[PDB]
């Protein structure tokens, strides 16, 4: 019935995933009066805000060595390579990551919960990417790719189709990018927050995974 949910999440979840979860959660009559406050940020900022209880729940990347935090699979993304339409790689439709070795990257900053996965991909193929600059949020990244300031590896998100960039699928190496519903282990959680948590986990299994 009544209550508030403070939900923090990583940037790319704002465009479609969180709205879809909230829309479907709230069509149930007994959820109409539940309210939210929504916070956006990078995984490394979000984890402290879970521990200090600013957030009831979070949607973010998995983080190693956080035994106080429960990470439960919610959705997934596809990593792609994004280049300006004039770039030499734009002639291709798919590439191996090692094919990018010569080119300057717009790289995610260390705050990004994506960097463990990305770094492991480059380590797997023994490539040390040329990093031209760092950015945290995704629209700033594709913005810089669109003026050919560099290339990037990033999640395939709907906005990429609206910049003057070519999106390339990655053949090798292989990857899965999972996104998690994160919460404090052994912690008291309000009835509304628990209702949203269970709802979102069911929804992700049925529709996202």
């Amino acid at each position: 019935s009544h209550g508030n949910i403070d939900l923090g999440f990583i940037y790319t979840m704002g465009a479609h995933t969180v709205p879809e979860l909230v829309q479907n959660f709230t069509k149930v009559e007994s959820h109409k009066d539940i309210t939210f406050s929504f916070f956006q940020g990078a995984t490394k900022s979000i984890i402290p805000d879970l521990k200090n209880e600013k957030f009831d729940l979070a949607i973010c990347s998995y983080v190693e060595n956080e035994p106080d935090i429960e990470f439960l699979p919610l959705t997934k993304q596809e990593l792609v390579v994004v280049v300006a339409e004039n770039h030499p790689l734009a002639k291709y439709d798919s590439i191996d990551l090692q094919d990018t070795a010569d080119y300057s990257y717009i790289f995610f900053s260390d705050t990004s919960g994506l960097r463990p996965l990305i770094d492991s991909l480059f380590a797997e193929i023994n490539i040390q990417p040329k990093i031209g600059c760092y950015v945290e949020e995704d629209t700033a990244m594709v913005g810089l790719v669109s003026v050919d300031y560099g290339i990037s590896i990033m999640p395939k998100i709907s906005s990429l189709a609206h910049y003057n960039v070519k999106v390339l699928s990655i053949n090798e190496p292989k990857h899965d990018r999972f996104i998690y519903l994160a919460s404090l282990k052994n912690h008291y959680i309000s009835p509304a927050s628990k209702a949203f948590k269970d709802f979102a986990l069911r929804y992700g299994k049925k529709h996202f995974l």
Binding site: Y62, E64, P73, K76, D176, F178, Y180, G204, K205, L209
Partner: peptide, 9 residues
């Protein structure tokens, strides 16, 4: 389907 896979670390 991918839920189980997502639990592996």
């Amino acid at each position: 389907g991918a839920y189980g896979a997502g639990l592996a670390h």
